[PDB]
Design a protein around this ligand. Structure first.
Ligand SMILES: [Cl-]
Ligand SMILES: [Cl-]
Ligand code: NA
Ligand code: NA
Lengths: 78, 78
């Protein structure tokens, strides 16, 4: 069981508070605004995201996926 | 069968060429740098992304997921 957190956070400063907190909960950065990690927590994840981002302005997707779907992703670039 | 395309494209101009092309192939924008769509195409999707982005610099994830995993996402914010 995996999950992805993908975010669109307007305030520069809120964006890296969130990045910092996602690392702390053990997720790993895969791109500038996306992290992945293993199923562990959930309720804390949502609370963290809600407390940090501007909910009228920002968008965060927290998406479950199976391990085999993540494994079969295609990654283009660096 | 769904997929997500999540991107981290440095050049402003390449980013919306990609956004424009992802809409054309029928994907739908869900956030500033993420689109979702249904399984249809695949080989064309990868070719499009590779031709548009700078592959030494940019990162794009093309991620398959089951319909029920997408349905059970949590979306925070606007
Ligand atoms: Cl990766
Ligand atoms: Cl959505
Ligand atoms: Na990104
Ligand atoms: Na985004």
């Amino acid at each position: 069981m995996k999950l992805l957190v993908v975010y669109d956070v307007s305030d520069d400063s809120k964006r890296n508070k969130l990045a910092n907190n996602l690392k702390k909960l053990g997720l790993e950065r895969i791109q500038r605004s996306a992290f992945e990690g293993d199923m562990d927590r959930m309720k804390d994840l949502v609370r963290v995201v809600k407390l940090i981002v501007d909910t009228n302005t920002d968008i965060v997707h927290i998406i479950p996926l199976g391990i085999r779907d993540w494994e079969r992703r295609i990654v283009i670039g660096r």
